[PDB]
Amino acid sequence: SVRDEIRSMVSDSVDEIVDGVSKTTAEVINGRKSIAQYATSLIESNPEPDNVRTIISQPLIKNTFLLVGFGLEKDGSNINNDPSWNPGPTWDPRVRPWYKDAKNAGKLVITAPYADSASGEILVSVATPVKDSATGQFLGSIFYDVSLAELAELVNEVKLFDAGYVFIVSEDGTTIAHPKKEFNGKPMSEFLGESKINVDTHQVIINGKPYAVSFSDVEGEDWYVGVVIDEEIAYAALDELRRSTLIHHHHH
Amino acid sequence: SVRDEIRSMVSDSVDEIVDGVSKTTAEVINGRKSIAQYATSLIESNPEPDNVRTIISQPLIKNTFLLVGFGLEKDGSNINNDPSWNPGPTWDPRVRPWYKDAKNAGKLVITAPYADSASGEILVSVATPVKDSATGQFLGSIFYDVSLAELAELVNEVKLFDAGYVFIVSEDGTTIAHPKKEFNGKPMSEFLGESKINVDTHQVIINGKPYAVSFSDVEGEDWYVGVVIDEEIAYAALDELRRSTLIHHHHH
């Protein structure tokens, strides 16, 4: 009954992977949100353009986000942290989804996926409203852009026996991050066949071949981490481990 | 040969635990170092006391560190982020280990454990020198205090089968964080018997009982994570898992 022991380990492995990655993802994303909130709070204390630039141009900010910009309600001007960035002459921050999301929420949010103004790539942004200390009046919003390809790479650093991959979706099945960039912002049905999240681990047929799919909620956003695993490949990897370990122990 | 399979899983589990925790620890500590560097860089841009206070008094800073203070070379004054903190009337930041460590290193460092001036608790600090923009002359140093009890709790969040615990030591065997506060800053021999780090997983006798001990380097500091595990307890936990899984599968 070795086949049984290993098949059981595969099934359990699928669940432990998705649970672990959802915890990892929550930690990373919450960390970035906290950095964004800190920068925003400093800006609210003194929103003078030079001070804004100093706050958003430090290595921590440059390395944590793709791009950061503060758009002003008064005139649609912006202060950003990349002199090379140019969204075109008619760009108005006040009509962008990050700006409206933050304005309407009145607190830090993460946007749904949308197409970047300059690059056209699908991304999400952490977005915060800026209120002046004295009056609490809306001065504008700040975006902190998040690369979805980077997020996909990050969650796939997990060991998966070469048997599949991890992805992130929102509660309605919208793809947040897939190893294949083409699916970002698109319905997960485009790569899973299934359109809605079924949290219980289950089999799915893709390209006429069976895969195990499982999900786990991400605490802090309305996202889930999903995994797609070829259990035949996983079984082989684990069986190899078992045999290799035995042999090695005979001579050590 | 079920005993063999499980004993093997225990041995492998010991190693995977220490490796995983050392990766986790590196990530968390590097994150805190990056936040400290960011705050320091903002302060260097404008070290006026009110601006310093604004930078260090935000929730992110308050929540990431126990306490933050900027000590001045000129007169031994300080600006800190806790009006309730009082180290006594003769406290001079310029003679403290965090201050000298940062001054001498000329870059961000983490101190060896030392006794806090106000509380007497053993802690470590992230410490950074502050140089003025124009002249690059030393203005003073900033400490960002790290709770060792919190760090011990953090690294012990890992699942250990109720079979033992995780700790952190520096390369010379000095305890950085132990679940039992009494050992912090003391030689690891006080709880392990062994005085030097042996990275290969090995058996150690403690209180006349055998334990498996393993270590893994932490990238970014001269620290190691160690684990002490009762393999008899671990075997039982894993055997229970195997049996429970089998039974559950018979009816599901």
Author numbering:
A (entry chain A), B (entry chain A): 57 to 308
Authors' description from the paper:
Extracellular signals are sensed by methyl-accepting chemotaxis proteins (MCPs), also known as chemoreceptors. Indeed, we found that Mlp37, the closest homolog of Mlp24, serves as a chemoreceptor for taurine as well as serine, arginine and other amino acids.
In contrast, the l-serine complex forms a dimer with a molecule related by crystallographic two-fold symmetry. The indole NH of Trp-154 and the main-chain amino group of Ser-173 also contribute to the binding of the carboxyl group of the l-serine ligand. Such an opening would allow larger amino acid R groups of other amino acids to stick out from the pocket without significantly affecting interactions with the amino acid backbone atoms, a situation that could explain the ability of Mlp37 to sense a diversity of amino acids. The l-serine complex, in which the hydroxyl group of the ligand points toward the small opening of pocket I, reveals the molecular basis for the diversity of amino acids that can be sensed by Mlp37. The slightly open conformation of pocket I in the serine complex enabled us to visualise ligand binding in vivo with a fluorescently labelled amino acid.
